[PDB]
Design a protein around this ligand. Structure first.
Ligand SMILES: [Mg+2]
Ligand SMILES: [Mg+2]
Ligand SMILES: [Mg+2]
Ligand SMILES: [Mg+2]
Ligand SMILES: [Mg+2]
Ligand SMILES: [Mg+2]
Ligand SMILES: [Mg+2]
Ligand SMILES: [Mg+2]
Ligand SMILES: [Mg+2]
Ligand SMILES: [Mg+2]
Ligand SMILES: [Mg+2]
Ligand SMILES: [Mg+2]
Ligand SMILES: [Mg+2]
Ligand SMILES: [Mg+2]
Ligand SMILES: [Mg+2]
Ligand SMILES: [Mg+2]
Ligand SMILES: [Mg+2]
Ligand SMILES: [Mg+2]
Ligand SMILES: [Mg+2]
Ligand SMILES: [Mg+2]
Ligand SMILES: [Mg+2]
Ligand SMILES: [Mg+2]
Ligand SMILES: [Mg+2]
Ligand SMILES: [Mg+2]
Ligand SMILES: [Mg+2]
Ligand SMILES: [Mg+2]
Ligand SMILES: [Mg+2]
Ligand SMILES: [Mg+2]
Ligand SMILES: [Mg+2]
Ligand SMILES: [Mg+2]
Ligand SMILES: [Mg+2]
Ligand SMILES: [Mg+2]
Ligand SMILES: [Mg+2]
Ligand SMILES: [Mg+2]
Ligand SMILES: [Mg+2]
Ligand SMILES: [Mg+2]
Ligand SMILES: [Mg+2]
Ligand SMILES: [Mg+2]
Ligand SMILES: [Mg+2]
Ligand SMILES: [Mg+2]
Ligand SMILES: [Mg+2]
Ligand SMILES: [Mg+2]
Ligand SMILES: [Mg+2]
Ligand SMILES: [Mg+2]
Ligand SMILES: [Mg+2]
Ligand SMILES: [Mg+2]
Ligand SMILES: [Mg+2]
Ligand SMILES: [Mg+2]
Ligand SMILES: [Mg+2]
Ligand SMILES: [Mg+2]
Ligand SMILES: [Mg+2]
Ligand SMILES: [Mg+2]
Ligand SMILES: [Mg+2]
Ligand SMILES: [Mg+2]
Ligand SMILES: [Mg+2]
Ligand SMILES: [Mg+2]
Ligand SMILES: [Mg+2]
Ligand SMILES: [Mg+2]
Ligand SMILES: [Mg+2]
Ligand SMILES: [Mg+2]
Ligand SMILES: [Mg+2]
Ligand SMILES: [Mg+2]
Ligand SMILES: [Mg+2]
Ligand SMILES: [Mg+2]
Ligand SMILES: [Zn+2]
Lengths: 98, 91, 139
RNA sequence: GCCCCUAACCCGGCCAUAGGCGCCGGUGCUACACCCGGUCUCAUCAGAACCCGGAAGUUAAGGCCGGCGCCGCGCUCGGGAGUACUGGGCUCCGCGAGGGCCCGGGAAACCGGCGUGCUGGGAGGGGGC
RNA sequence: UCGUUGCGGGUCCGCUUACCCGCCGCAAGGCGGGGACAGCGGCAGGCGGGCUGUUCGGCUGGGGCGGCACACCCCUGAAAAGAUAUCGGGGGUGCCCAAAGCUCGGCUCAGGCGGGUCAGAAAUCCGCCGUAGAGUGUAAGGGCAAAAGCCGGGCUGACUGGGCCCUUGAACGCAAGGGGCCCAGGCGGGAAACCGGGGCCUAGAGAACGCUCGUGCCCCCACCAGUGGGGGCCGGGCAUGACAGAAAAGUUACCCUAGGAAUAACCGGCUCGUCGCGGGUGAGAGUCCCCAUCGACCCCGCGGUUUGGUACCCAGACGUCGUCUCUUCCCAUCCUGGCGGUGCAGCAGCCGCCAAGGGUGGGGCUGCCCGCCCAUUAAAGGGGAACGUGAGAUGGGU
RNA sequence: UGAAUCCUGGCCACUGGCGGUACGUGAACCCCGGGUACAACCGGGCGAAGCGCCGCUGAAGGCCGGGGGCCCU
RNA sequence: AGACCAAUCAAGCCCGGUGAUAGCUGGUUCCCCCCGAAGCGGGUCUCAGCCCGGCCUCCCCGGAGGCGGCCGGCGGGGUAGAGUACUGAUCGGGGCCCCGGUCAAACUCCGAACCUGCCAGCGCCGUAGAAGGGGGGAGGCGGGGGCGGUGGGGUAAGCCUCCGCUCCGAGACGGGAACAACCGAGACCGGGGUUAAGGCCCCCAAGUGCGGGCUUAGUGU
RNA sequence: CACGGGCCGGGGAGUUCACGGCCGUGGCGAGCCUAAGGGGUUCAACCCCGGAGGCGUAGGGAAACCGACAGCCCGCAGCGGGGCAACCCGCGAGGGGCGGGGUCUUAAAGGGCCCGUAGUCACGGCCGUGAGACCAGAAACCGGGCGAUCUAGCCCUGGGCAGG
RNA sequence: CUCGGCUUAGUUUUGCCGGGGGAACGCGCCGGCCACUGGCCGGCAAGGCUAAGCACGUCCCGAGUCCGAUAGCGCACUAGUA
RNA sequence: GCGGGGAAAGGAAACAUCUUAGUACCCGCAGGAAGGGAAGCCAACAGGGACCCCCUGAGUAGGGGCGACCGAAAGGGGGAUA
């Protein structure tokens, strides 16, 4: 039977947490202020799944283009196609590697 | 599912919230002067097979629930769909 | 009752059900269909097989094909006793133990079929009791 | 104002080395508490709680600090172990499923050892500008 | 039913001249009967395979029956980025809810223990423990403890007008559907922050044409103005589940055409579960005694001899069962030759080994093959050769 | 159906055919009302056969099983 | 008897519509030169067809960066193994607990090799034109072999169905006795030389080559 | 051991038109071209006339209706300056981005389409769609006619059938 | 006008045929893309004829980037013949 | 050439409305041509002025399982002119 494609269709491992990470996450990711040109890493937080980007963007590095209210507009790539991810900071981490 | 007979709803004409009476949508009667009905009656005249398709196999169990919300202040009517489910009971 | 036996044959032989309740046009119990109906009578049977070894000859139909398929009511058990929700379970158990038929139709007051009692239902009553969310009515 | 040093208090980050059980001590001008009342704001079955007004009593408890033991947890430590597993090559073995050699990576359980919160800002206190 | 359909009298009666039926007559016309009926034409409803045209879907370890792997969702397969198939495995979906939706506050669950009037395993009360062992509508997976659960207060954001992005649809074209972030209008809850464009997240989903409803001091309708009516743009609904959307039943052995070894039947190839044959093991039987003869429970094999699995070759074609006739080969040997064991006294029997030179026959029954049977016999073995051999026959069966 | 001869059982549920008072349904015409300066259009009334319904029919196409106590089902 | 109706009948013959239509089968005619595929994804009354993408080719615009490799910095991941701690399975010992043992595609405290994102460098390609864009023409939308994922299924299969590198199809030639895809290796034409795989008793170019040991079965080669 | 050809000679398959897209050239250019037809000719050629009409020059909107650029930045070529060169700097057509403008929707914001120049006519080529459409191939269906010397049935009128 | 039908781009709107109904008269009648009303505009159906300019090819004449005896018409010939 | 009767195959990748096509074919009737022809017209308040045929309008309006596909007229330029 063909693969089904719901928005979260092969995400058991990705959305699972170890026992020591159970419960609410810390709030420091909320407090980073990103400006255009900043580099961020998409690190999905499973306790806020409805605002999380698609599983294909986990671990990708994007560039902040701007803000939309409280979300950040991030320019990234899936293979060769440019993608625009709009997401809240709880699903973002600063990329220190350049 | 039960649904109220009166709700407080935004009225675009009044540009404010007003009380709205709720009722089921009922389709009006097909009028013989409708252009598509005039064309059909023309097509039905003369010899030939039945001229148009007529569906025989149906698959939906329920129709979409459509409700008419009438503004009690100005009479503006909003007809909205609540999705496909069995007929609501207006309470 | 008017269904073709080919529609339900695999579900019986494969054991996915222990029997069928056969309904008339009004939803009443016309009868019962189990494997024993297929063992008692061969009115349903038609031979088949792989294509024949047609070589060096003029034969125009090399493979047997089934064309007139028997209807269910032609081979069903007619006139089975039906049960009501207030029917004693011991009368059903006596029937099943005596005749080895493990399906009994259940009808409402108007005779319309609303379900059936299987031999697995009877065992459940004798072993545990009522099913979840059910109450034992007076007999 | 400013800079530096610095307990318990306030706001935090990481979220057990911070948790849990038991035992032994320290701390009280100030600060934190327990504490005293219910007219007022507010509150409930209940001034217990919440909220308000206080300051008689107390470090018995909480908080904070030090020590010991056990459990739990942590560690870029020793062993386990270059073991298990693995990327690349092979006219190398085996009847075969499979194994072996060479180049490159390399665990985990467990046993032992060590550890048992660290830290950012502020008030207060001390010293100078 | 409209017309043919006329004339008198009060829907009814009558009449004849229409019209119809028959007789006579070359014709003219006469006679009799019926009679505004019937008959005939148009229109309308019913019955109507009598006749005409067509449709009788797909996937498929050949087709068919079944199933829906045909549209969706979760886990696994899936090989630690992404993608990933099979008629692969385990399940689910075509809803339900005015709350099971929004928000604010308070609280803590399953279970256990101690005490307490009925009272009890389980009711309400006091206390202690309790990492979630509960709950969260609904599959599965994920999330959640001053909550995402339970209770209570106030509500309708399951809102109007729009924009951008993600997924469906990987990198890489491409519906509908779903989700996210916002701007404006106007609200709900809240001290505020903030949250609300349904349900904690991942499923419950429908083009064109047609119709219908909503909306606008809205646009158009043929020289001009008016009235009725019609059309248009924007949005909601009515449906295609074969779910990127025809309106659709059989049967052919009377069959026909185009093709296909993309695909079955025979033979061949591969495989050997099945079939046949061999070996290891030794519980147990054999008076005693495992192995004279056996061989439970298990295990290792060989053959290609039954049956199946597969679909590689052959559809401009390899003549389809058996038998007859005729030749040859194998050995896992039935007899004949040699040897051994025995639970071998003799007569017989049983078992093993070497050995394929020769023999292995005649009948009854059935289309058979196989098998059963009859009288003999040293014995009346089994297999292979395009299931040897139909350009050799036969033609009983299929 | 298939000479003759002895015979030819039970069943009208189904599929057909036929008969029928009432009732429901059932087209065009027609009538009434609304609408339209007229129409289109909208509603109602009347209502044939037929169908529903009730009966007859098997030398019509055919069918002829269970359970229970000759009886019931 | 679906018989027969002029060798024609489950619907005659003649001429006409008519060059009926055919996603199917057959055929499709001179030379050299350049580049050079595909049988994958999605949709389709779709499964022997077709369309949109991937892959080929030709032309043009554009204008400096690009990435089948490696190192490092900064990240992601939950497979192999491991474990039996959550959810389950399971054999024993000891007093619902403790100890030992057997397991897991739909279990996971841990956790590689490995793959992958951004940046910097190396390496290579690129102004004789990177990225990007436009236009014309396609073919093709049946694939197959080896090796690897115990991939998943199956008794197994020269079996079915996925994932990846390479090769055949579309690739000559040497070796493998023959032999598309095994090994070696990539061919403009002629000649000389040296090697690869593999071989060197004869067939058959090159050793009846060297040391040690084993086998007596022509085992084997 | 898949199918086709005995041999030889001769014959034997992408064509034409219309419309569309694109390319390579040629003419003219904010314009380009004539059609039918007319006059002349050395008479289907050729010279001249014919501008009807078609396409372009402006778009948006269903429609009523309304109706458009030289402002800024980046920057290839090129040019200029400096430098032994490397390279740096300036201007910068075309190209790219913004801004501005026309119009539709909306209460508006936002959003859609469009705007600061190139077309048109022809010749050759490739491809698409129709026409028979590269060549060969059904079983069929319909129109109008022909047939009962065969055969099937029947009607009218003749003939035949030893012997037992 | 109405009903049925064939047809037409003719669409609530083309032409006609058939069944049924059926005018008026110049102070009238008809048309102006649904019907009606008012205005304006244009006309006079239901009778008949009509040259020229246009289709065709048995036939005659001319021409040709056409074919050249398996080609070209079936026929270059005692071919619509045997 | 004029009047009438009148298909299917094929296409729509099935098929019935539709198309093919008022075609093939059939029946009737003329001429060297036939038919048409002298406003109950077209237009839009400005004006054309019988008819047929050619070029255009134009694959536009419009018809159509609004699918395949079908498809004018007025106006303009000509031949000729009564
Ligand atoms: Mg897919
Ligand atoms: Mg949500
Ligand atoms: Mg057949
Ligand atoms: Mg009458
Ligand atoms: Mg009549
Ligand atoms: Mg029929
Ligand atoms: Mg169908
Ligand atoms: Mg099929
Ligand atoms: Mg099926
Ligand atoms: Mg993955
Ligand atoms: Mg849900
Ligand atoms: Mg809450
Ligand atoms: Mg899709
Ligand atoms: Mg893609
Ligand atoms: Mg969906
Ligand atoms: Mg007009
Ligand atoms: Mg589909
Ligand atoms: Mg053979
Ligand atoms: Mg076979
Ligand atoms: Mg066996
Ligand atoms: Mg033994
Ligand atoms: Mg076999
Ligand atoms: Mg094959
Ligand atoms: Mg072969
Ligand atoms: Mg052959
Ligand atoms: Mg042969
Ligand atoms: Mg042959
Ligand atoms: Mg032997
Ligand atoms: Mg044979
Ligand atoms: Mg023969
Ligand atoms: Mg032979
Ligand atoms: Mg026979
Ligand atoms: Mg026979
Ligand atoms: Mg009888
Ligand atoms: Mg027959
Ligand atoms: Mg016929
Ligand atoms: Mg026929
Ligand atoms: Mg013919
Ligand atoms: Mg090349
Ligand atoms: Mg083929
Ligand atoms: Mg790296
Ligand atoms: Mg493992
Ligand atoms: Mg293990
Ligand atoms: Mg991977
Ligand atoms: Mg394929
Ligand atoms: Mg492969
Ligand atoms: Mg090929
Ligand atoms: Mg070789
Ligand atoms: Mg030599
Ligand atoms: Mg062939
Ligand atoms: Mg041949
Ligand atoms: Mg074509
Ligand atoms: Mg036909
Ligand atoms: Mg005919
Ligand atoms: Mg005769
Ligand atoms: Mg007059
Ligand atoms: Mg000739
Ligand atoms: Mg010659
Ligand atoms: Mg044709
Ligand atoms: Mg068709
Ligand atoms: Mg057809
Ligand atoms: Mg004339
Ligand atoms: Mg004339
Ligand atoms: Mg036409
Ligand atoms: Zn209002």
């Amino acid at each position: 039977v063909k693969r089904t494609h719901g928005y979260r269709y092969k995400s058991r491992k990705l959305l699972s947490k170890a026992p020591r990470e159970r419960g609410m996450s810390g709030l420091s990711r909320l407090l980073y202020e990103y400006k255009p040109g900043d580099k961020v890493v998409i690190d999905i937080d499973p306790t806020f799944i409805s605002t999380a980007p698609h599983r294909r963007y986990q671990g990708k590095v994007g560039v902040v283009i701007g803000t939309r209210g409280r979300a950040y507009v991030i320019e990234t790539y899936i293979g060769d196609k440019k993608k625009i991810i709009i997401t809240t900071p709880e699903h973002l981490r600063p990329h220190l590697g350049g | 599912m039960k649904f109220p007979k009166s709700v407080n709803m935004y009225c675009p004409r009044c540009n404010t919230y007003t009380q709205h009476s709720v009722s089921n949508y009922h389709g009006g009667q097909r009028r013989s002067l409708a252009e598509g009905q005039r064309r059909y009656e023309r097509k039905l005249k003369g010899y030939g097979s039945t001229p148009k398709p007529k569906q025989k196999r149906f698959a939906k169990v329920n129709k979409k629930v459509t409700l008419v919300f009438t503004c009690t202040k100005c009479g503006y009517k909003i007809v909205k769909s609540l999705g496909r489910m069995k007929k609501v009971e207006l309470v | 009752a008017i269904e073709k036996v080919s529609k339900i044959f695999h579900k019986l032989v494969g054991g996915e059900v222990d029997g069928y309740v056969v309904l008339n046009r009004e939803g009443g119990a016309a009868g019962i269909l189990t494997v024993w109906n297929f063992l008692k009578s061969r009115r349903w049977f038609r031979g088949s097989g792989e294509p024949r070894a047609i070589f060096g000859t003029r034969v125009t139909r090399g493979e047997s094909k089934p064309r007139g398929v028997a209807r269910v009511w032609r081979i069903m058990s007619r006139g089975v006793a039906v049960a009501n929700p207030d029917t004693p379970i011991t009368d059903v158990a006596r029937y099943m133990a005596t005749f080895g038929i493990y399906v009994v139709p259940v009808v409402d007051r108007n005779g319309k079929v609303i379900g059936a009692v299987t031999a697995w239902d009877v065992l459940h009553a004798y072993l545990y009791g009522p099913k979840e969310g059910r109450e034992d009515v007076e007999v």
